[PDB]
Design a protein around this ligand. Structure first.
Ligand SMILES: [Mg+2]
Ligand SMILES: [Mg+2]
Ligand SMILES: [Mg+2]
Ligand SMILES: [Mg+2]
Lengths: 424, 423
């Protein structure tokens, strides 16, 4: 009977994210007793057009970062708005949530309250169907185990070192399947720890589990990773390639991009040239947010000049937002989008952005935030969407490894190809 | 009772919070219910811990694969347990121990055995349609535990110069557990500002505590004190300290080496050193203050300071009822750190707890420095009524997942918070 998908109750609670800041978790209980549960991540380098992350701003509670207001919105308005409705229709529930909030940026109820509800409903649906989450999430795309881009040296907003570039990532693109890809990246990660330790560089980790040394230059960071790849026995280019998240909106000030670690200040043109030179020296296949979220003329130039040679990922540029991605597609900027559910607030709108990217030749990279939880939703969504690439952290900290472990579990019975080099 | 019978047991290799392989098991009942559990891994491991079976293939995960343990679950353990009931935890655990037939579980591996033991416990809870902590209680009065929160990491958990492994705060003055978690978190974030303002490292070690270099252990305690005060809490009334020295890591050739302070100590001298710390700071608990083999030292420590401070045996006892029994008889320590993977079954862990309770020893439910997303120790801490948990700093989901599970239990458990009763 299909009334078994009807919602009995929705509730939320405050939990801690992986940085120690509160975030929201929602439980959706159906009339059969089944409970779908999901929690919401939180970024540090957040684009200016991300949907509203509703916080309490009480200085006497968690330094103003409580989320009891968002919890209260789930317990009250959202619960009573959705009770008796079916979780079988994800689009209908997300539509009701957006209309209940009735603001462009989800600032009445909070994008975190809406997303917690949206994802918990998706899990309640999957439990009702008695199928793994990734199966219930697929909308016809050919599923693959994704290639991970693994952020093993952290900088920028994620660490207190002098590193300007936010993320230095390795991608085990030459691996034959996902378990071996994880093994390769893990082995490189541990060799990198030894390489750093021998040079007296910091091996404590930043927010995403990558080491947080001070570096002499971005090139030194890439040299250190190259050294670790070689000492682990893998081949640059053939086995492992590089991806970067510059998070350049964090470096843009007063009309210039500031590479403080290198005492350099670049206009847009000079930073494009800077990237072209890095690409000619290292196998960098992907650059995320190479330019500022408002530098649309720069992004167009970057895409024309280097887009044939490298993947260019809009993160803050697009904020997982179909309206913004549509404008970017029309203007010809970037060729990939970083998919962050909590940048937009619902599964359904995330799916819109994915469809708009696929239909127009853009790749999708499924992504964590730097503030994670134990929730592994993005592992199932990466597989289900067939996007072929995931960005979910270094190889330490369970906020990251829990996603890698969920991919290992999915790989057991999914009988799916590894995206591998097809992502190029 | 047909609904509690085992259909199949299987295992898989996953990554722990340090990036090293570990084992996770699924126990599938004839009803289709699946109990799942994974196994943590220590860094400063006692010499008498049960065998953590690794593959030792240098071409694979630097020799730290656990496929041998996974295969022991898939084959020997599955075949031995097919058709038995998870209703009786002691029976399954007895069967697992007899199947291995070695003193330190070196044939199947304590990790293979523990993964099965805990997965069976979960499948049992699910079959009873009861929260895990409910199904784990064995008559003790349940409480929400006071957390000791390791917010400055050293020793084997970070590559800084810090000798003491763990500097912990305990929000003993909090009215309930959510407020205790809030207190510790607020201090954690303030401590980050304190360190950052002094130019000290705020990247984190294995358990989520900051990993700066320090001038001395007193300086570290001063830095924690400054953060407690700037966060607006009171030393003593609100917040007290606990330490894990992991002194077996510091012991070599008759002396304990505090390299960071350019000093070494014999056992007698290190006892004095603790006495002086305790008189300068509100330290209420010292774990592994002496080497795992320094039994004469531990006796002296216990007689001299045991009425003033909690003395937690960790490597001293390795959650092993046989060793705890010897220690109680000799009068050493007054608490035990409970680590399921030091002994290898839930049933033997429960034996240690009961043996401690029956003799006036306190129990501290504990993580390992290498954790997984598994939150079993949150439910076990509550179910045991031990009143104290050690499960990490206030960042890294390997730690916060356990605090989050305690928040979830607290919602409907209607249980008191152990508070100052832990003294
Ligand atoms: Mg960002
Ligand atoms: Mg980014
Ligand atoms: Mg230890
Ligand atoms: Mg210890």
């Amino acid at each position: 009977h299909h009334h078994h998908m009807h919602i009995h109750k929705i509730q939320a609670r405050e939990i801690l994210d992986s940085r120690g800041n509160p975030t929201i978790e929602a439980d959706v209980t159906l009339t059969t007793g089944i409970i779908g549960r999901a929690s919401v991540p939180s970024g540090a380098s957040t684009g200016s057009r991300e949907a509203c992350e509703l916080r309490d701003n009480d200085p006497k509670r968690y330094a103003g970062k409580g989320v009891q207001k968002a919890v209260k919105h789930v317990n009250n308005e959202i619960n009573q708005a959705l009770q008796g409705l079916s979780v079988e229709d994800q689009e209908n529930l997300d539509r009701i949530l957006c209309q209940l909030d009735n603001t462009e940026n989800k600032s009445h109820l909070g994008a975190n309250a809406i997303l917690a509800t949206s994802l918990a409903c998706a899990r309640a649906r999957a439990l009702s169907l008695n199928q793994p989450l990734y199966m219930t999430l697929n909308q016809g795309d050919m599923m693959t185990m994704p290639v991970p881009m693994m952020n093993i040296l952290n900088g920028g907003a994620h660490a207190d070192n002098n590193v300007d570039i936010q993320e230095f990532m390795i991608m085990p693109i030459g691996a034959p399947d996902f378990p071996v890809a994880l093994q390769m990246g893990t082995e490189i990660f541990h060799v990198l720890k030894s390489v750093l330790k021998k040079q007296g560089l910091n091996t404590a980790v930043g927010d995403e589990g990558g080491f947080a040394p001070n570096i002499q230059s971005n090139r030194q960071a890439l040299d250190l990773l190259s050294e670790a790849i070689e000492k682990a026995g893998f081949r640059l280019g053939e086995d492992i390639v590089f991806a970067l998240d510059v998070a350049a909106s964090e470096l843009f000030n007063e009309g210039f991009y500031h590479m403080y670690s290198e005492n350099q200040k670049f206009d847009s043109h000079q930073l494009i040239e800077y990237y072209a030179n890095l690409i000619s020296s290292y196998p960098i296949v992907s650059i995320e947010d190479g330019l500022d979220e408002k530098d649309w003329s720069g992004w167009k130039q970057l895409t024309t000049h280097l887009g044939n040679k490298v993947q260019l990922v809009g993160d803050d540029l697009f904020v997982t937002n179909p309206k913004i991605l549509r404008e970017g597609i029309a203007q010809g900027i970037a060729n990939a989008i970083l998919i962050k559910v909590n940048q937009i607030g619902t599964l359904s709108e995330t799916r819109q952005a994915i469809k708009l990217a696929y239909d127009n030749g853009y790749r999708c990279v499924m992504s964590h935030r730097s503030g994670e939880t134990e929730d592994t939703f993005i592992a199932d969504l990466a597989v289900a969407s067939g996007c072929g690439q995931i960005k979910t952290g270094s190889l330490c900290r369970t906020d990251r490894t829990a996603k890698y472990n969920q991919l290992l579990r999915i790989n057991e019975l999914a009988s799916l190809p590894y995206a591998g080099k097809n992502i190029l």
